[PDB]
Design a protein around this ligand. Structure first.
Ligand code: NMY
Lengths: 88, 272
RNA sequence: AGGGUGAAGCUGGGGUGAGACCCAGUGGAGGCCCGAACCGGUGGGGGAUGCAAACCCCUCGGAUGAGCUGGGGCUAGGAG
RNA sequence: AGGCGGGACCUAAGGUGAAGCCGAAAGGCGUAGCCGAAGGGCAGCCGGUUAAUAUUCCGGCCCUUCCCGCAGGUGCGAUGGGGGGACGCUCUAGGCUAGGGGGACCGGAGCCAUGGACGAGCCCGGCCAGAAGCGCAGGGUGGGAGGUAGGCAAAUCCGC
RNA sequence: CCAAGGAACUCUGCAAGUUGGCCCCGUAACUUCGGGAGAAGGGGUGCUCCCUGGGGUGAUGAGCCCCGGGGAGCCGCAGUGAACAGGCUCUGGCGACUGUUUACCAAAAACACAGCUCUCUGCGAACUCGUAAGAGGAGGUAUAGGGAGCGACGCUUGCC
RNA sequence: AUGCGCAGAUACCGGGAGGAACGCCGAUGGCGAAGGCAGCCACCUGGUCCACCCGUGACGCUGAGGCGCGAAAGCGUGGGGAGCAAACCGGAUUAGAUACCCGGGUAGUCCACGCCCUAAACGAUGCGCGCUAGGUCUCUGGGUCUCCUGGGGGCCGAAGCUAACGCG
RNA sequence: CAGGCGCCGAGGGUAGGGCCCGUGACUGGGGCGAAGUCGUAACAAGGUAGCUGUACCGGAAGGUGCGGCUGGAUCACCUCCUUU
């Protein structure tokens, strides 16, 4: 489940600069990761509509933030796109 | 090696409502098996309607375990035969030889199970009643020891263990009744393998039924020259009679039949 | 004989969480659909001591299924 | 007609039937072994010759088992255990003759009748069988060793 | 073979003629969204020469099969040129539809039937033949094997 | 009445089977977009409250359309029915009683996967922010925790709002 | 120049569909004109309170079960407003 450690490690791989204790980068890393192992679970289950739901809202959130990502700058952004994989 | 029930062809003209089933072992049976004559005609006089055939394999299956009462066996795997209401497992006995046996609740290829003098009450092994953990399930079960697996609850998921008394344990049998068998006798552990089958749907009758092998039945079939009942007209007769000089369909058959009182009670009925 | 039809599975592309499910390609199943050999035999017509103790013609239905067919057998006649 | 076929072999349905169960009698039922099939299995083909028959005759080419021997080689040695020959239907890739088809392609007996064309014109044919040696395709799997508490009663063979 | 008229003949358009070969344009109420569609209604094709693409075969170059595609044009009343080859639409009762039969009139309802319900039998089941014997049944074993009235399916099966 | 019992029940004792439910604790109490959600245990999960002020850098509020979500009833196949139980059958009723009562018993009620979205769906009152006395209680996070502070629930409650309640 | 050649289409015909109109025994039905032949839910706990979504049964209003929304009367429990 939620492995804090490795977590921070990637918050790291991403946060271009070691001083990103909360940045678009991370909103990204995080919502992503979560979204994914979470969802995978969703699959082998089929009925937890409540949490499915939340997950929903969440994914929204993340994507939208990215929205802004583009808004100001999608450049570095597309790089992100890249690094990650999502939206292809 | 289980099997799909539901697959149904679709609108391939009136071939409508045709239910498929597919055991996955799909292998063609093995070494131990002859074939049956073309009975329907028999003792050379001829008898009982329907009857027709359609292709030809024909079985030999194990009905008796006390004959190795122990050599673990591992599911050779699944498969079946042009007979039986609920597939089989060709099983492998650790000693080399194998045997076509039941096919209780969805067990598992390679699974080890066996039976005899104390078998683990795990659906799959079999045991002398007595090892009956009262409240459990089996089938195949046989009263009068040695008289082989007597009461082969076909796809008959039905041997419900219901208490004991004397040298006989009580059982709830398909039918909706409770008989008794002296404990030393035996039961295949667990339950059957098929039922949905029982629900299977088949297309253009002629086609299906016949394929089944069976042709027909046609009552008070006009010209009641015989056909017990009336005919030579529309109207359904009255008397209240059936084919070959019959008693309708609401009368006994049993008797002293020392058989009867001897065990079982519940008397013959259900109520779904 | 021959020809059209064009399911299921699958493969890929499409949309959620995965998925439904879609589209497309593959596919090419029984019903079959079209229609000879094959099997039946209305619809009309042609013989009345007719080619004939049940026919010829024009025609017509099925044309993989409860299909058709040669060989070998068992049930039979108050029984089949 | 040793080599085509059928028996000199196999067996299902299926009939018989030593046993056995059974009828007032005559019979009814019947394992086993047997009888019992263009269903199994098995060793040749092509060219030539009679008024007339043929892969049966003749001839060329290719084998078949069984007996006597000899030469080389081995636990050889039942048919009883086993493995094994054995199998739908629908469809269907890949690979070879049959078998179609144009060769003016080579052999040949002839022709324009008729206004014409002798000109890749017509007309006829241009193969079939061949130990195996060999080159296309594929077509049908495991070596061991050991444990080898089943064996499929009796033992290295199968199967765990 | 007909014309003039084109069913009034006629109990019935019985029959017979219409019509029918593939390719493109296009296609109704209803629907178990499989389909009723070969609906239906048009139009096409023959043969010439010209520009233009393709799947064959040892690349691929006299070696062939698919459409090409399009263009200009040729001759008939006429161009699946002859023989194979739908008349059609609307609508109603029954029945589902595949079917078998009625050998000798009775293409077709009836009987099938899939699928409904009642209900019968504990297996040495219950019946069916049998003088026992015995087989059958079922090496099946109550989701199974019989007696049945109905007969997809949809709504629905009330009163004694 | 009734229906069930001397072919012994109704009560008491022991044992058997299974379905459902889940007491006290448990609350005027809690979590959830809503619906609605509870014997404990474990697997995976989501909303969400407080404090350091550390990160980013306004990316945010709204949501026609759609998209997924969910009462109970009922349908679909496949399980299952201990009890309860429209329907049905009785018995009691009045003049009538198809219903209010007692005696019965199906479907359903329950599980899986699919399907209906249904509404006095309620606080009959859309969401998002910020401005205006206090008093009280109760649960919950932080503290110099006679209390204070962020959050969360009922209660009293100036101004004020309304045709009037009553909101506060 | 005449005509010839070419589509062009006003126009009409045959076939088919679409929008709306009228329209048809019988028919589900809708609204009302003081003085009617039946019972009577609902509002007083309207006498099983009701109301509702759903399901099912009935001369009819309606009853019944599933679930729920109070726009449900009387004691018994506690918090909180005032007060002789
Ligand atoms: N049509 C209205 C609907 O049906 C009913 O109304 C109808 C009905 O009640 C009422 O009928 C009433 C009866 O009752 C009452 N018991 C006797 C009375 N004579 C009769 O009157 C009726 O017949 C009269 C004959 N001289 C006419 O004048 C009068 O217009 C007519 N209503 O009149 C309405 C007819 O239109 C419901 N009452 C109402 O609630 C619902 O909305």
């Amino acid at each position: 489940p939620i492995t804090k450690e490795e977590k921070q490690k990637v918050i790291q791989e991403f946060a271009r600069f070691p001083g990103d204790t909360g940045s678009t980068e991370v909103q990204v890393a995080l919502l992503t990761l979560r979204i994914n192992r979470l969802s995978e679970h969703l699959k082998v289950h089929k009925k937890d509509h409540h949490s499915h739901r939340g997950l929903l809202m969440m994914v929204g959130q993340r994507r939208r933030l990215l929205r802004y990502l583009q808004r100001e700058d999608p450049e570095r952004y597309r790089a992100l796109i890249e690094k990650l994989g999502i939206r292809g | 090696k289980f099997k799909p029930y539901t697959p149904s062809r679709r609108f391939m003209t009136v071939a409508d409502f045709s239910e498929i089933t597919k055991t996955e072992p799909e292998k063609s049976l093995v070494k131990p098996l002859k074939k049956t004559g073309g009975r329907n005609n028999q003792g050379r006089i001829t008898v009982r309607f329907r009857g027709g055939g359609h292709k030809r394999l024909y079985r030999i299956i194990d009905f008796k375990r006390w004959d190795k009462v122990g050599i673990p066996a591992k599911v050779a795997a699944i498969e079946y035969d042009p007979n039986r209401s609920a597939r089989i497992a060709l099983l492998h006995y650790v000693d080399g030889e194998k045997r076509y046996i039941i096919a209780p609740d969805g067990l598992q290829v390679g699974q080890q199970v066996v039976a005899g003098p104390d078998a683990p009450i795990q659906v799959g092994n079999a045991l002398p009643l007595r090892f009956i953990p009262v409240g459990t399930v089996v089938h195949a079960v046989e009263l009068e020891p040695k008289k082989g697996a007597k009461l082969a609850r076909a796809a008959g998921t039905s041997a419900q263990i219901q208490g004991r008394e004397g040298d006989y344990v009580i059982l709830r049998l398909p039918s909706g009744e409770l008989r008794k068998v002296h404990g030393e006798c035996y039961a295949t552990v667990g339950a059957v393998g098929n039922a949905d089958h029982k629900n299977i749907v088949l297309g253009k009758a002629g086609r299906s039924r016949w394929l089944g092998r069976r042709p027909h039945v046609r009552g008070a079939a006009m010209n009641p020259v015989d056909h017990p009942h009336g005919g030579g007209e529309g109207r359904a007769p009255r008397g209240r009679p059936p084919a070959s000089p019959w008693g309708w369909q609401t009368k006994g058959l049993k008797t002293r039949k020392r058989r009867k009182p001897s065990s079982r009670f519940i008397i013959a009925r259900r109520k779904k």
